[PDB]
Amino acid sequence: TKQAPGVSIITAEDIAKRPPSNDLSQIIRTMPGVNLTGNSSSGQRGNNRQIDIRGMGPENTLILVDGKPVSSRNSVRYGWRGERDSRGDTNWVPADQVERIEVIRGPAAARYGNGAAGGVVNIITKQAGAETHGNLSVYSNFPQHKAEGASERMSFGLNGPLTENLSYRVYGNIAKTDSDDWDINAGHESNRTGKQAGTLPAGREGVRNKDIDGLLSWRLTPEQTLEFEAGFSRQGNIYTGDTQNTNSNNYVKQMLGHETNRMYRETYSVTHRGEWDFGSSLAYLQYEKTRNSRINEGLAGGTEGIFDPNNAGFYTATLRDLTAHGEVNLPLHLGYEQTLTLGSEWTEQKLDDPSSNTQNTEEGGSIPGLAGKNRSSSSSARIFSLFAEDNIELMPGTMLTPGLRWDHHDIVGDNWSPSLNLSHALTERVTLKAGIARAYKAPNLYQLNPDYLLYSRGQGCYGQSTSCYLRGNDGLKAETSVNKELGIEYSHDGLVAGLTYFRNDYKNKIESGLSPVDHASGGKGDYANAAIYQWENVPKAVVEGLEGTLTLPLADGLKWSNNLTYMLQSKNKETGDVLSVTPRYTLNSMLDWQATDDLSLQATVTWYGKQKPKKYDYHGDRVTGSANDQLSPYAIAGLGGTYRLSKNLSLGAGVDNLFDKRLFRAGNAQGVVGIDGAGAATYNEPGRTFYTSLTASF
Ligand SMILES: [Fe+3]
């Protein structure tokens, strides 16, 4: 099946039956314990929501492609409120070239290491077979309302052998999601008066996609295979007015419909696979060069996250990420029938950002130890890891899996990650599963680097109205989370029913500081001698919720499937406020009717629960007025089908959001000078949308 306590699988047939518009987050989010949200409660960049697992934030959601990590979004500025102006790392592989997607959540994912506190998403691509095969896929949607941007997607795949010890696979994809119109949120915007009059919260950022990848599989011996593959990906956007604080200037209005940020992503990887008497072996090297070229942006209060016209033009943040890994596997026949995996892993993250370390100290005063101008554009860190997994069978069916992962981070230090996962067959139909593990999140190179500096004249400062600075902190402790999961599941004859309770105890979550650690000297007027905050380690935090699934075979050709997330609590224990805004529940329901041998119709409905914004503003004072707005529960229904016309060609068509339920971004969560708050109305929900698909394959 596709659901077990902690794990979920998405097949290629699953993707073809609920086709994404462009980004795979559309289909990944429908899994239990998975939401689409930002990394904090600011509402900033609210239309750029990424995959969140169990309310731990997208920053704790490790994206893999065939086991190799994706770190491209680390090349984007990590804002004061923990929000990069990034669309996530799920749009790198085209939808119709994915074989399957694995989603590992909670304690079963801590073994993967740094950034797996929420979970792990492994995007697995279709490989070459014993023959030569190829495919051609075309998706195109048509929203009822013209303001919402439409998506068009064309991809191909091609695979096969060349010699008798050499195989290959290539795929190319070209896709475009039109941006929402600039004025799509007009009339729904928050109250805007004074200098901020007319400023609109923006719709969904558009994107152009150029993806190219080719693979060479060389099986030199019976037991040994060596693979080379290279990837070239480009993502240019279509700007529609998005700024951090929903303010606007003239540089913005000039760039509407223009390309203000482009991500070149380059990936080369040498993979080796070996399998013999004693067991199996795997080791790879990957180099990921990300170039994040975008228009320069200010770094001070309201000018944070807006096109800075004093320094017009593009800069280029460059991210060289190097990951090498290797593991061997061992079946053991001892006092208990077990399996043993032994592996190591090394990563290097080089970050060149010529624009984030530029905020000077002429208005708040010089900071001792921090130069005012020409600070280094470079940040870097490395983690070396060793690990071992003991997959034990105590008695046939029942399984126990303790494991230890050790990481040495060249700035923060040592981390011991002890995982223990238990699966008990209480019956041939019922399985109880429990697990507890202490996951790992090393600070990102913006929270670390003490040359990274943001400034505010007071509005963003916690516990005052005077000007203040926020600064990096290279003494930070890593984020650690104890992820308790306990679940049970019944599985027999297509009938599956399961419920799981998770409670991740979130120790040392990095966030913007609360108490000032210093004060500067110098500056201008009322702003001089501004206080100094640094990125802290929030002592304790908690997330808690429920994961459920129920699949009933109504008839032989009919299947009713259900996935349920219910978020019980998400609390920053130090401040008390929420740490992430997710719906109270999410219930996805699909009815899969196999109408004929050569036809299949699908009906989908997704219930979203209530959504509550944050209690306290950037000051820490309880918000007032329209910043308390909540989003009411609502549902999105859809119909679709896939009409097979031959063993070579297939056609799909359907409608998303049958009832045209629409939501509009009104701004960020809280109010500021001139711009009232928007509360939970931080994103645009798309309306009724028709779509069609085409797949030719041999
Ligand atoms: Fe300000």
UniProtKB/Swiss-Prot annotation:
Q: Which InterPro entries match?
A: Plug_dom, Plug_dom_sf, TonB-dep_rcpt-like, TonB-dep_rcpt_b-brl, TonB_rcpt_b-brl_sf, TonB_rcpt_CS, TonB_sidphr_rcpt
Q: Does the keyword Metal-binding apply?
A: no
Q: Spell out the GO cellular component terms annotated for this protein, sorted alphabetically and separated by semicolons.
A: cell outer membrane; outer membrane
Its job: Specific receptor for the siderophore ferric enterobactin.
Q: Where is this region: Disordered?
A: 34-54, 187-206, 349-376
User: Any stretches that span the bilayer, and where are they?
Assistant: none
This protein's gene is called pfeA
Q: This chain belongs to which protein, by name?
A: Ferric enterobactin receptor
Induction, as annotated: By iron and enterobactin.
Q: Where in the cell is it found?
A: Cell outer membrane
